[PDB]
Specification:
alpha+beta; Jelly Rolls; seven-stranded mixed β-sheet; four-stranded antiparallel β-sheet; 10 helices; globular; binds 2,4-dichloro-N-(pyridin-3-yl)benzamide; binds chloride ion; binds manganese (II) ion; Lysine-specific demethylase 3B; oxidoreductase/oxidoreductase inhibitor; PanDDA; XChemExplorer
Length: 340
Amino acid sequence: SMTSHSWLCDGRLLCLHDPSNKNNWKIFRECWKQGQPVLVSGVHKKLKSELWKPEAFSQEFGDQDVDLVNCRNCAIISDVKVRDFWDGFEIICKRLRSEDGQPMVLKLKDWPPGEDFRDMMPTRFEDLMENLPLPEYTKRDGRLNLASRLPSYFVRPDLGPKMYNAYGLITAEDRRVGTTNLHLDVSDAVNVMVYVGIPIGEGAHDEEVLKTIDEGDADEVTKERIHDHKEKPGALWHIYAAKDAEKIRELLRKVGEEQGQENPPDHDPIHDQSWYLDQTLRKRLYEEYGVQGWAIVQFLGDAVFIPAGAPHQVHNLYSCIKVAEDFVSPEHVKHCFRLT
Ligand SMILES: O=C(Nc1cccnc1)c1ccc(Cl)cc1Cl
Ligand SMILES: [Cl-]
Ligand SMILES: [Cl-]
Ligand SMILES: [Cl-]
Ligand SMILES: [Cl-]
Ligand SMILES: [Mn+2]
């Protein structure tokens, strides 16, 4: 039967079922005040599905010049065309191949560039902003979004939204690699999964995808969502409470040293955006520092709410198109204050 919500992560993660329900705020706000992430499902049923397809981006913007990143080694592929990324998104025989002849796992860097999303893509901008959940928090002019209402004593987010466009990680060796490495944002954000591309020519490979989710420490109810309803899983997230950021720095300082890195004792390994916490490092963080995370599988149409200051990392299971909007809730405004 239809219900307002359910729980993931053994009761530690709220999952809201109706993205446009006028009463979502009554359930959301207590979890949000405690510093928890929140998941909202069903957002892709509210969008214009034809706007959010890799073939459309290629047809409309393919002649633009861009840089790509190789997810396996962080190398930059300079001055190629936007079509060189989009045309290999789902069809593996069309992907750029490395010097070993393997198809590469690529990310589109800074596209659209800076704050140009709204000017370049006005129909997509309207379709996203009118269908974001928790609109008093997430709309540019929402009554609980302080972004437009704060003086320069507060760090204000850039004008959004921002896209996260990257291929799926494939191999056993890729299991320990990040799509986006561990980092934090001083503003709150909502990240929406608007398209999942599953290759059928040499993809749609549950086997290595099921071992990744298992080893990723996904909960039993998340593991039922794969086998039962057949929704399309996009990406594996690990999110940590803002209050645990310094203990994570203490762990990565120690591991850096053990690995023969040469770093001052106050150096910030989260700000460096150089680390991915694999199964070994996540087990050490829990056992040695007492720090537990949220392991979240983001399916098509899932919106992930990421608290200001909360360290997070993402590992794409398949090729993903994600769009995110920043906001400043009153619950977390301390994270962007420039004094004490
Ligand atoms: O040309 C290349 N790779 C290729 C060609 C045809 C089929 N598979 C792979 C290539 C790619 C990258 C670099 Cl830095 C050097 C070369 Cl030489
Ligand atoms: Cl558009
Ligand atoms: Cl709201
Ligand atoms: Cl990264
Ligand atoms: Cl907080
Ligand atoms: Mn982020």
